[PDB]
Design a binder for this molecule. Structure first.
Ligand SMILES: O=C(O)CNC(=O)C(=O)O
Ligand SMILES: [Mg+2]
Ligand code: NI
Ligand SMILES: [Zn+2]
Length: 331
């Protein structure tokens, strides 16, 4: 069995290996990368996502989200308070202001310590889930706006033709902006490219151990757990590495820098934070190996998780018994 300790693997494809996206994912899996729940891919030195980032300031963040925390430093939830629209140039200036900028620090480890000590005492503003792409249309390799769609994968594997679309999303972050513990919708893969700016630290639980994280979360967030049998789908709960280690939960951590791709694998729980002003692009994707994970994915039916149009068909075809209840939660 490859990668039996479920370590995060880092890949350096050549320019020739970077041509065929599906083939390279399957390669990484042949080496056990999925066992970690997360892999890093460093593009060949010949590759670029686009020519420059000098002209992005006029992108609009229609609904910036202020991430307000409640709880204790290592075990907290966050809610998202909507703020007035602002441009990426305005948001960058905000991120760099004395109120929001990254503090002085020695290295990534010191910064990580400061994040876990101090996160809850501040409310950083995140531009999330903005439909669009920063890949140049002429970038042929690993262009997250040109990937094979999940609907076409389901159709290729299972023969059923379904409605829905699959497009990328932009994320503009600042110091302390936080992504809560979650798996993807329908336990899909994700791919995330850090276009510019400061790093993103990730934490991940191996897929084979995901239920250990879920059981800890039910203990740590007992009211939420009573409210919903899949409350991590709400994407609001944070648990620190120290707490995870205290409770024996297997996990790994890695820091993504600008120019690097991360892939999350089906049912790989992940969480993390941004080091300072940055911009990432991410999208879900599928492979044949995902299908069985999609059929088994938990679902929120309490009404909190509310998701895209395109997830309807996935539930309807893969999970027909659950469909009726889940759809009620959507409506
Ligand atoms: O970058 C972020 O804020 C969150 N991204 C992801 O969870 C991802 O790519 O799967
Ligand atoms: Mg612009
Ligand atoms: Ni994710
Ligand atoms: Zn729910």
């Amino acid at each position: 069995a490859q990668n039996p300790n479920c370590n995060i693997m880092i890949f350096h494809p050549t320019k020739e290996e970077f041509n065929d996206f599906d083939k390279y994912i399957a390669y990484m899996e042949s080496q056990g990368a999925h066992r970690a729940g997360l892999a890093k891919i460093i593009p060949p030195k010949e590759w670029k996502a686009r020519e420059t980032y000098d002209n992005i300031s006029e992108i609009l963040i229609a609904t910036p989200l202020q991430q307000v925390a409640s709880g204790r430093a290592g075990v907290f939830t966050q809610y998202h308070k909507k703020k007035k629209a602002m441009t990426v140039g305005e948001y960058r200036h905000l991120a760099n202001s004395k109120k929001y900028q990254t503090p002085p620090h020695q290295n990534f480890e010191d910064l990580e310590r400061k994040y876990w000590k101090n996160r809850i005492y501040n409310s950083p503003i995140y531009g999330a889930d903005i439909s669009g792409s920063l890949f140049d249309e002429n970038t042929k390799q690993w262009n997250l706006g040109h990937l094979g769609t999940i609907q076409d994968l389901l159709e290729k594997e299972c023969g059923v033709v379904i409605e829905g679309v699959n497009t990328p999303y932009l994320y503009f972050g600042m110091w302390k902006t936080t992504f809560a513990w979650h798996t993807e919708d329908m336990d899909l893969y994700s791919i995330n490219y850090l276009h510019l700016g400061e790093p993103k630290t990730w934490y991940v639980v191996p897929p084979e151990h995901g239920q250990r994280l879920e059981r800890l979360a039910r203990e740590l967030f007992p009211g939420s757990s009573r409210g919903c049998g899949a409350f991590l789908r709400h994407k609001v709960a944070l648990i620190s590495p120290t707490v995870l280690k205290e409770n024996g939960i297997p996990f790994n951590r890695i820091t993504q820098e600008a120019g690097e791709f991360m892939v999350t694998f089906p049912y790989g729980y992940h969480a993390g934070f941004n080091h300072g002003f940055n911009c990432a692009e991410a999208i879900n994707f599928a492979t044949p190996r995902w299908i069985d994970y999609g059929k088994m994915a938990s679902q929120c039916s309490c009404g909190e998780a509310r998701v895209t149009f395109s997830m309807d068909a996935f539930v309807r075809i893969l999970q027909p018994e659950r469909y009726d209840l889940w759809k009620r939660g959507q409506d």
